[PDB]
PDB file of C-alpha atoms and ligand atoms in Angstrom:
ATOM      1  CA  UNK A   1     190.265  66.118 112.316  1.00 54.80           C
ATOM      2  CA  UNK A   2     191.515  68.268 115.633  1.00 54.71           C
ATOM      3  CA  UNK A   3     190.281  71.563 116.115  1.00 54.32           C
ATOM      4  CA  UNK A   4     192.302  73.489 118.886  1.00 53.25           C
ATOM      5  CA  UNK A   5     190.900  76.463 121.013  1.00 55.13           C
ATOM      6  CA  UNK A   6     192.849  79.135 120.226  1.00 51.93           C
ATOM      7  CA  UNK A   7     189.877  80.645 118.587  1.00 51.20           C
ATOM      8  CA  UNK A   8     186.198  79.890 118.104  1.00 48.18           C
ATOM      9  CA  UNK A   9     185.717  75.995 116.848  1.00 47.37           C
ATOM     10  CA  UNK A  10     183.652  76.964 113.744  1.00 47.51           C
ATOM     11  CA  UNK A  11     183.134  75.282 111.267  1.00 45.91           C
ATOM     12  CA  UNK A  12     180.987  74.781 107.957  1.00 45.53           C
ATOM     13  CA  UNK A  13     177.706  73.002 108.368  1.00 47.16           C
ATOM     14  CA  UNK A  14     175.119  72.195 105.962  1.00 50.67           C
ATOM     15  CA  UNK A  15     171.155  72.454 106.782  1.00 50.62           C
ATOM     16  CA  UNK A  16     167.820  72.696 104.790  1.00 52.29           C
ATOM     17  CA  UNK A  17     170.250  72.944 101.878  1.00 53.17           C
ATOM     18  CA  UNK A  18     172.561  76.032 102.819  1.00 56.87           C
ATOM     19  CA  UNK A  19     175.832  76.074 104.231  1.00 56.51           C
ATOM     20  CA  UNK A  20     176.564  78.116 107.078  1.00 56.76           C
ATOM     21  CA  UNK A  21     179.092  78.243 109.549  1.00 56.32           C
ATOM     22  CA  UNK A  22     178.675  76.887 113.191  1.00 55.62           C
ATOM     23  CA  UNK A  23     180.336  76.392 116.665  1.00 53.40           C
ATOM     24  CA  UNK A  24     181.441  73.259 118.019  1.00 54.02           C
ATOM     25  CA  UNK A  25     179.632  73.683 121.215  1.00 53.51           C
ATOM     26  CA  UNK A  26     180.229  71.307 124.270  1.00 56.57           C
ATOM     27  CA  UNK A  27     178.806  73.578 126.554  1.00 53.26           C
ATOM     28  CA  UNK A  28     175.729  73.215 124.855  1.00 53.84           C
ATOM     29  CA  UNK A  29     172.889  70.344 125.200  1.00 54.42           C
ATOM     30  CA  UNK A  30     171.008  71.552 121.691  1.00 54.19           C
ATOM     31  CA  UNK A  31     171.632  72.616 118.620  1.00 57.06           C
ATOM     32  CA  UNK A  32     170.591  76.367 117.886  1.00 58.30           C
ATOM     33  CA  UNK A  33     170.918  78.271 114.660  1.00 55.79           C
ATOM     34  CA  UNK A  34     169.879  81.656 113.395  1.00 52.96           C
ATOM     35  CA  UNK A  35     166.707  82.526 112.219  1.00 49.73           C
ATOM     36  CA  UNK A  36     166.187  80.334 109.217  1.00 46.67           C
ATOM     37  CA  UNK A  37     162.737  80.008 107.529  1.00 46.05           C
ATOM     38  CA  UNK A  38     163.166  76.184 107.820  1.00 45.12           C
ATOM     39  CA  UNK A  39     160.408  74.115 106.432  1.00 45.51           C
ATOM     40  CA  UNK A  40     158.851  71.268 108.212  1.00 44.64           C
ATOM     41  CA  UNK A  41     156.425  71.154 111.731  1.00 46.75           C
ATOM     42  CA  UNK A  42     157.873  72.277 114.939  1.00 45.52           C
ATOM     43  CA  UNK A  43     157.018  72.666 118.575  1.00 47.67           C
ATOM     44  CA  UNK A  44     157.691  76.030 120.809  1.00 44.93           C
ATOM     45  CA  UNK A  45     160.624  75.679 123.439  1.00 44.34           C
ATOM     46  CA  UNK A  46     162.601  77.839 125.504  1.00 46.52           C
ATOM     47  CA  UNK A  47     166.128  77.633 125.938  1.00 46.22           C
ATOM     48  CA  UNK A  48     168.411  78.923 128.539  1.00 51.55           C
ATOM     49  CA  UNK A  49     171.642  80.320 128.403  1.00 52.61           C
ATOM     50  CA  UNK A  50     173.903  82.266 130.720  1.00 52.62           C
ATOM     51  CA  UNK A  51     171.734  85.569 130.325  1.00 53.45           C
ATOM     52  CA  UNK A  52     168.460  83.978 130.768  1.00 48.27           C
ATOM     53  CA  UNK A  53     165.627  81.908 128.297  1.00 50.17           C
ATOM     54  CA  UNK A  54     164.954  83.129 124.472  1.00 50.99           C
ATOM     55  CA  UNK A  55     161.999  81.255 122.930  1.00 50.26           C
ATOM     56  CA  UNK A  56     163.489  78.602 119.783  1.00 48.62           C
ATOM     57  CA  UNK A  57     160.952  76.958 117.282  1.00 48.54           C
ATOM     58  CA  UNK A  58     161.933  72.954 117.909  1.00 55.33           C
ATOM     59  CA  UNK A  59     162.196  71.084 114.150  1.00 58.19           C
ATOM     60  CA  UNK A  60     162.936  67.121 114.848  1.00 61.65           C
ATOM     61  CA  UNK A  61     164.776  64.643 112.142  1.00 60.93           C
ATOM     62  CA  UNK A  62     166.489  67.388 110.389  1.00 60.87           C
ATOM     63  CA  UNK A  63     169.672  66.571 108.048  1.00 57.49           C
ATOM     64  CA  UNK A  64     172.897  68.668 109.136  1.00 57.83           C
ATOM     65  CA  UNK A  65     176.361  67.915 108.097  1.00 55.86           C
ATOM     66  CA  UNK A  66     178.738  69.140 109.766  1.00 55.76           C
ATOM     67  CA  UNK A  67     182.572  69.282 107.980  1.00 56.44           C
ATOM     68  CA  UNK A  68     181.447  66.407 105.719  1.00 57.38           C
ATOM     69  CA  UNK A  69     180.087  64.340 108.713  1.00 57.67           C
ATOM     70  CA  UNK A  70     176.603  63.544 108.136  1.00 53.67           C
ATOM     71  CA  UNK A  71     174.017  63.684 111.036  1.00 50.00           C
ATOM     72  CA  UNK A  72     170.235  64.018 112.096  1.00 49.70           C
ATOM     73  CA  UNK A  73     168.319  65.033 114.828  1.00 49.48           C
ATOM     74  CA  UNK A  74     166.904  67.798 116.386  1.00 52.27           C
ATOM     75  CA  UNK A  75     167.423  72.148 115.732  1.00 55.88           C
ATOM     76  CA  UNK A  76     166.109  74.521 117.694  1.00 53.62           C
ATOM     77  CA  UNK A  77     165.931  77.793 115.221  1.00 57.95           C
ATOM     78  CA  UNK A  78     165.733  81.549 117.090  1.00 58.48           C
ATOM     79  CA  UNK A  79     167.407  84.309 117.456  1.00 57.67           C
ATOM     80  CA  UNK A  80     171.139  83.754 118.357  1.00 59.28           C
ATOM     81  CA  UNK A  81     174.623  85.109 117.058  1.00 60.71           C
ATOM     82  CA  UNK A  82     176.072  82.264 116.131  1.00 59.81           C
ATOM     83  CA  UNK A  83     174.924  79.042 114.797  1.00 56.85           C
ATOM     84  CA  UNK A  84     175.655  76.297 117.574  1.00 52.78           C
ATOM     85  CA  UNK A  85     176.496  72.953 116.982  1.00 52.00           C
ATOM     86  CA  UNK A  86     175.185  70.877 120.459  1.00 50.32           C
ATOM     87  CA  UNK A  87     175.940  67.956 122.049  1.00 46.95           C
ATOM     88  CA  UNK A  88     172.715  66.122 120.573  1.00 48.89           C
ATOM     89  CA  UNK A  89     175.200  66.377 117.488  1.00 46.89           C
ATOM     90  CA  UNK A  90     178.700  66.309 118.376  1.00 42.60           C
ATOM     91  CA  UNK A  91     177.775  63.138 119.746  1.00 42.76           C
ATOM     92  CA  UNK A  92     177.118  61.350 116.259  1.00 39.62           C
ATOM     93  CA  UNK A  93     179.962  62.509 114.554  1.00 39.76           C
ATOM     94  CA  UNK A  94     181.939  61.156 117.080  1.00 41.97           C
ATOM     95  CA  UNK A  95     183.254  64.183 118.534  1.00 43.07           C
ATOM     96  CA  UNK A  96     185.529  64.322 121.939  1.00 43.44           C
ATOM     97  CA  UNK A  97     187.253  66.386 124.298  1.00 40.31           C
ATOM     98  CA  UNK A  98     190.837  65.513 124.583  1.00 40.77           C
ATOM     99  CA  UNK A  99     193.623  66.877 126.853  1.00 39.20           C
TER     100      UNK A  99
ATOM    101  CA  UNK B   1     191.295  61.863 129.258  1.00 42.90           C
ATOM    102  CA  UNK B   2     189.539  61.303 126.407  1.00 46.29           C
ATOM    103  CA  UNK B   3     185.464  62.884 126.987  1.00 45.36           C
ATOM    104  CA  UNK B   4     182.846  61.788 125.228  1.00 45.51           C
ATOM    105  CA  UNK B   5     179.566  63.960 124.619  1.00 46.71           C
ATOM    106  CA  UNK B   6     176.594  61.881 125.776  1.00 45.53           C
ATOM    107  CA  UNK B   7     176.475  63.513 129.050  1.00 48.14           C
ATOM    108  CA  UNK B   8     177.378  67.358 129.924  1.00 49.25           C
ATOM    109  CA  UNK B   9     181.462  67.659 130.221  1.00 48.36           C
ATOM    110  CA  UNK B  10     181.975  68.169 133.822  1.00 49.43           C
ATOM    111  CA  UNK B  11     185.071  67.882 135.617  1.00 51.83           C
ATOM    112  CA  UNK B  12     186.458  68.558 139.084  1.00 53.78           C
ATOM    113  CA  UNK B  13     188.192  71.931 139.438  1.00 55.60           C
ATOM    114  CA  UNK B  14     190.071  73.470 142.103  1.00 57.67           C
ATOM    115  CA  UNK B  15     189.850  77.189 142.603  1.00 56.63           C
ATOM    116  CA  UNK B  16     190.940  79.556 145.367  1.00 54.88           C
ATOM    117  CA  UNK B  17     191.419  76.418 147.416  1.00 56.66           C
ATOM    118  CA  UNK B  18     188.262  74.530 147.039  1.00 56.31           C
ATOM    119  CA  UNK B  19     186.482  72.332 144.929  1.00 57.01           C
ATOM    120  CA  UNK B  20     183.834  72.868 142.169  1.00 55.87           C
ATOM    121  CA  UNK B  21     181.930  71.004 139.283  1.00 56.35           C
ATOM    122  CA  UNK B  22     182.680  72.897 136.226  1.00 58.40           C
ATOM    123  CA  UNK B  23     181.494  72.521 132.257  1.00 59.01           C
ATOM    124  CA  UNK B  24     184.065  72.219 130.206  1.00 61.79           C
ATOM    125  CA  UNK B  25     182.719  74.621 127.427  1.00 62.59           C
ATOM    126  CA  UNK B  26     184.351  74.917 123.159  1.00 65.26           C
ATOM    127  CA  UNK B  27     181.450  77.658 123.059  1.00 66.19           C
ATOM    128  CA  UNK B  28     182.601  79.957 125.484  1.00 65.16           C
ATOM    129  CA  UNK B  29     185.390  82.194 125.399  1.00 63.70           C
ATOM    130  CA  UNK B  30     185.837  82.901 129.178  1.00 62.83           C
ATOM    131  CA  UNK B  31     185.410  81.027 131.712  1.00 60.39           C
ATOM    132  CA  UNK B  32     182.263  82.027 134.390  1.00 60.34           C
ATOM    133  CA  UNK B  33     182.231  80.720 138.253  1.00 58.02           C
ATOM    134  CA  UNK B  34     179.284  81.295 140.163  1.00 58.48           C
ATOM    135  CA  UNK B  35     179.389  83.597 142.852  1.00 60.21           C
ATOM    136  CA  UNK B  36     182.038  82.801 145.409  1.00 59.99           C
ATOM    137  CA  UNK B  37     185.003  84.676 147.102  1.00 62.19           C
ATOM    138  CA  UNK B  38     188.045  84.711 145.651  1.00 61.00           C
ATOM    139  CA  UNK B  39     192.026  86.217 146.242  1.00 59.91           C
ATOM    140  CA  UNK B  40     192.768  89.755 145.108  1.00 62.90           C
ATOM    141  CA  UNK B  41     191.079  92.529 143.412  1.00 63.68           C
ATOM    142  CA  UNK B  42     188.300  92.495 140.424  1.00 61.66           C
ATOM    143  CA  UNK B  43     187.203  94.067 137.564  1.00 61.02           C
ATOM    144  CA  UNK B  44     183.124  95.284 137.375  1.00 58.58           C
ATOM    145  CA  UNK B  45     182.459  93.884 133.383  1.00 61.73           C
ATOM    146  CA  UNK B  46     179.714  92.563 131.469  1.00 61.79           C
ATOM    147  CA  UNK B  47     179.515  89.106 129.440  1.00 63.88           C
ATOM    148  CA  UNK B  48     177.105  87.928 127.232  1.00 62.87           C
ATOM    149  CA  UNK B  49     175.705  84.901 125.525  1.00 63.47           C
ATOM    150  CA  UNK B  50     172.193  82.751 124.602  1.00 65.13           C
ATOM    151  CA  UNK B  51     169.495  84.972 126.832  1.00 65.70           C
ATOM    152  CA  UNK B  52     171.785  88.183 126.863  1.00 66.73           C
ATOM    153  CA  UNK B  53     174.219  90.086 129.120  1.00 67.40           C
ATOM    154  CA  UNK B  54     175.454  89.496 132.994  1.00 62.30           C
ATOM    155  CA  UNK B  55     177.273  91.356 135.376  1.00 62.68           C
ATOM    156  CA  UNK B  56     180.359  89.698 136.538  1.00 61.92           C
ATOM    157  CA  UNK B  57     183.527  90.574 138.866  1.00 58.09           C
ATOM    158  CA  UNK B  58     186.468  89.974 136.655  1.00 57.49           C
ATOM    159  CA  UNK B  59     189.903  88.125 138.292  1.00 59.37           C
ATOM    160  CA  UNK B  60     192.890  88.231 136.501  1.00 57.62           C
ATOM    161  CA  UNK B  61     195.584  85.619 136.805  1.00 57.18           C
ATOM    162  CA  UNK B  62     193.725  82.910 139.073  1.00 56.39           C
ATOM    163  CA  UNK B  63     195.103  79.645 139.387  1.00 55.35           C
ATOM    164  CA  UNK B  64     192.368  76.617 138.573  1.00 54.78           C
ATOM    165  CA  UNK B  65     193.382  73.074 138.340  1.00 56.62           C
ATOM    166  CA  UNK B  66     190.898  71.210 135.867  1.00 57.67           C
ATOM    167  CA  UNK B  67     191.360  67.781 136.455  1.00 58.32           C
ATOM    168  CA  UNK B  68     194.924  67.559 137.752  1.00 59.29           C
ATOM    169  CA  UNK B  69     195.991  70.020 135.032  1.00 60.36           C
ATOM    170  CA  UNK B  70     197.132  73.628 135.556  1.00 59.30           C
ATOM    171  CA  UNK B  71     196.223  76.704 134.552  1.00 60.77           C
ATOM    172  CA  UNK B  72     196.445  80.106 135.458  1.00 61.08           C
ATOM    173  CA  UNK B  73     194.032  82.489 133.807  1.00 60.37           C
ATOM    174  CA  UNK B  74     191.115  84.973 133.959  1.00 63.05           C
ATOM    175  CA  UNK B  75     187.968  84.022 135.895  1.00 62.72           C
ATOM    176  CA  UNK B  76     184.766  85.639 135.965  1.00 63.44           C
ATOM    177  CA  UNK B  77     183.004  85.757 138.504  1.00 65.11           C
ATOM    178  CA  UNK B  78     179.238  86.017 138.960  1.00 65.68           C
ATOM    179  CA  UNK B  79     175.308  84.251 138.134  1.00 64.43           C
ATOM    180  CA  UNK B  80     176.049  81.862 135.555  1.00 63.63           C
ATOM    181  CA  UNK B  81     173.429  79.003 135.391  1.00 63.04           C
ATOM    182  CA  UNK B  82     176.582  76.799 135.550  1.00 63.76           C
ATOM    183  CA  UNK B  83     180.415  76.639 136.344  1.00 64.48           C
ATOM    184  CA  UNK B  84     181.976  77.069 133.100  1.00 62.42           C
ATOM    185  CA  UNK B  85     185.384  76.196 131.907  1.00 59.32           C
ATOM    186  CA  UNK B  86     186.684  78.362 128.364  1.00 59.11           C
ATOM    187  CA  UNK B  87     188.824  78.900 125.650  1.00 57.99           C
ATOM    188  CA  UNK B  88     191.043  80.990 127.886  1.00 56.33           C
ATOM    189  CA  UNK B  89     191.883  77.939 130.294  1.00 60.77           C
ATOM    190  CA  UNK B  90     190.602  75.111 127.921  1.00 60.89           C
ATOM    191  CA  UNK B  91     193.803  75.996 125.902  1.00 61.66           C
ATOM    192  CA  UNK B  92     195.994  76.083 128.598  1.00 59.09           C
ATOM    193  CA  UNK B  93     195.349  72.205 129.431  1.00 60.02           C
ATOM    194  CA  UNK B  94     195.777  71.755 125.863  1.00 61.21           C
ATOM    195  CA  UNK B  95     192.451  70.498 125.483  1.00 59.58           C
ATOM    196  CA  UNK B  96     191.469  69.895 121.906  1.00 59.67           C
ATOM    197  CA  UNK B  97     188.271  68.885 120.037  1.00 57.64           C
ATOM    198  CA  UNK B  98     188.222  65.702 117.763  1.00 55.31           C
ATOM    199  CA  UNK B  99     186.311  63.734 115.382  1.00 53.65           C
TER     200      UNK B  99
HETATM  201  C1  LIG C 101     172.717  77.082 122.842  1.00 58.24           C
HETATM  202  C2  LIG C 101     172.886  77.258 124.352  1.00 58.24           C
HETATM  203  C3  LIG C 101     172.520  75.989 125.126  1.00 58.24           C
HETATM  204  C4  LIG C 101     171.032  75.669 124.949  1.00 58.24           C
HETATM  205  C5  LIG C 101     172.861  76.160 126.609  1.00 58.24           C
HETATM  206  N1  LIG C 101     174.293  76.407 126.835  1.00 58.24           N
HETATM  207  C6  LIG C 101     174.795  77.630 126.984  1.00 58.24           C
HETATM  208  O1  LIG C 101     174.138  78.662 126.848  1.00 58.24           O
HETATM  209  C7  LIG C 101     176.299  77.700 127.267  1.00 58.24           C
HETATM  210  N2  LIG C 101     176.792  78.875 126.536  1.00 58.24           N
HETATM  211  C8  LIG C 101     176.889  78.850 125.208  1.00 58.24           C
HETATM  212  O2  LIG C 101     176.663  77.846 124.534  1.00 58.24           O
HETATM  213  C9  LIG C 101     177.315  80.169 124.558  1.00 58.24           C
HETATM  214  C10 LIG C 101     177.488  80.024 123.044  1.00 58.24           C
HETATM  215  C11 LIG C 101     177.726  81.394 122.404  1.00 58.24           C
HETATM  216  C12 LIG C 101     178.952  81.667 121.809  1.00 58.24           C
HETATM  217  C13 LIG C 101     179.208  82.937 121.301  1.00 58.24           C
HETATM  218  C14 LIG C 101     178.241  83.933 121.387  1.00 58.24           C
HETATM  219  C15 LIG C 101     177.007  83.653 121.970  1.00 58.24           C
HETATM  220  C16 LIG C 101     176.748  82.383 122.478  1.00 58.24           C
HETATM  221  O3  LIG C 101     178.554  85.180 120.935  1.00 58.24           O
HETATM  222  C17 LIG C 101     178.221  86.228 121.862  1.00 58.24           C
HETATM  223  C18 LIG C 101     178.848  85.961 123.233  1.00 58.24           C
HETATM  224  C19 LIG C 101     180.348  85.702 123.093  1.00 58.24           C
HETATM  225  C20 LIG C 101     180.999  85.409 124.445  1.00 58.24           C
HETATM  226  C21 LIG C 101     180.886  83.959 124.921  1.00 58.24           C
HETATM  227  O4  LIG C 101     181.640  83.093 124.480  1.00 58.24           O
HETATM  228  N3  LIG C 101     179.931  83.723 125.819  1.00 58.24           N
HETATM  229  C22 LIG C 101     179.750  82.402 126.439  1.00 58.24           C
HETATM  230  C23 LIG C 101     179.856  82.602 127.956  1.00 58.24           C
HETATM  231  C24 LIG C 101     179.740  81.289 128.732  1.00 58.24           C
HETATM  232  C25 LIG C 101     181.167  83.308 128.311  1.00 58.24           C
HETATM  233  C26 LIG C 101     178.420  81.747 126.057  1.00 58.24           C
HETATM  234  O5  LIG C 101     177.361  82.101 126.574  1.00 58.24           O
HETATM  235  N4  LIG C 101     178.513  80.742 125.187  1.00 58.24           N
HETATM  236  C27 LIG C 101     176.559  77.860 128.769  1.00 58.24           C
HETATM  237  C28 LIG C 101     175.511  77.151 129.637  1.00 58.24           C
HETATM  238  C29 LIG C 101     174.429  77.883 130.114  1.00 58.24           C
HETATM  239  C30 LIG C 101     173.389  77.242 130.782  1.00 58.24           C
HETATM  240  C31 LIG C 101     173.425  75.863 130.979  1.00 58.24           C
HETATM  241  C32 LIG C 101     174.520  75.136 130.518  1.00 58.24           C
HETATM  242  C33 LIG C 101     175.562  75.777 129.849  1.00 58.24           C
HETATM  243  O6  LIG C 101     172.412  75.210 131.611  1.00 58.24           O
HETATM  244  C34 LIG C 101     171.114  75.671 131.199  1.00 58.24           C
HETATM  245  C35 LIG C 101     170.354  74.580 130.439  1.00 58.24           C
HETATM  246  C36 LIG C 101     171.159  74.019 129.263  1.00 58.24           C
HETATM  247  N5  LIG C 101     171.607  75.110 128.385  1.00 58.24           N
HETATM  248  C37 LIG C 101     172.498  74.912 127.416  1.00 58.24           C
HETATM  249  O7  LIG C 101     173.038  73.831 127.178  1.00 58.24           O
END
């Protein structure tokens, strides 16, 4: 599909079995979503955005789909406003910029 | 062009004259320059994101060509980790996203 920018690219995403909605995110090199009591091991990291670092709980190999495109790899969970869909993601569903 | 995600999204702008690397960002909704001078008089406001709120001089109605295309827009101005290109200009080029 084409998503234009008129508003905020979100869309519905589904991870460790819910469906939430999440932001195409270009400007972004990971994949963040809110605090989610995901299952699974993870590692501590710290993330930085244009206000400074918040502290994310890294979970590897995790299943997301995003609009019916399925994908796997790496979520950082933490404390954020919106659920953002990186490019460690975009990339496998074969998402580009166009203009 | 068409941009694939592998690598960060940055293009060539010009602004106020001269030349800048800027992100070309679906997860932003305005567009941040690093400190720099620029034409005309700003706006004190406050922007936020992943790590919290900045402090940033606000421009109104700056011209900024993103990779040989035009736009004219507003353009915040101050410490952003990196040069970033929004919704507010992205649509302007007529960028889309697609997958
Ligand atoms: C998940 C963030 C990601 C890890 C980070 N990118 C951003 O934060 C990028 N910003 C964003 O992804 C956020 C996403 C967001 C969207 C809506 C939000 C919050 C966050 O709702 C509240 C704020 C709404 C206003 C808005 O759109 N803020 C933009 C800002 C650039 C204007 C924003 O921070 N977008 C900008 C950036 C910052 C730093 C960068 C590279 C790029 O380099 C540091 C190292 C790599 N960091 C990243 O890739």
């Amino acid at each position: 599909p084409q998503i234009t920018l008129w508003k905020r690219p979100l869309v519905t995403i589904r991870i460790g079995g819910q469906l939430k909605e999440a932001l195409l995110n270009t400007g972004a090199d990971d994949t963040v979503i809110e605090e989610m009591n995901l299952p699974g091991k993870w590692k501590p990291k710290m993330i930085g955005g244009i206000g400074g670092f918040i502290k994310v709980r890294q979970y590897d190999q995790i299943p997301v789909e995003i609009a019916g495109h399925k994908a796997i790899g790496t979520v950082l969970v933490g404390p954020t406003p919106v659920n953002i869909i990186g490019r460690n993601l975009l990339t496998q569903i074969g998402a580009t910029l166009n203009f």
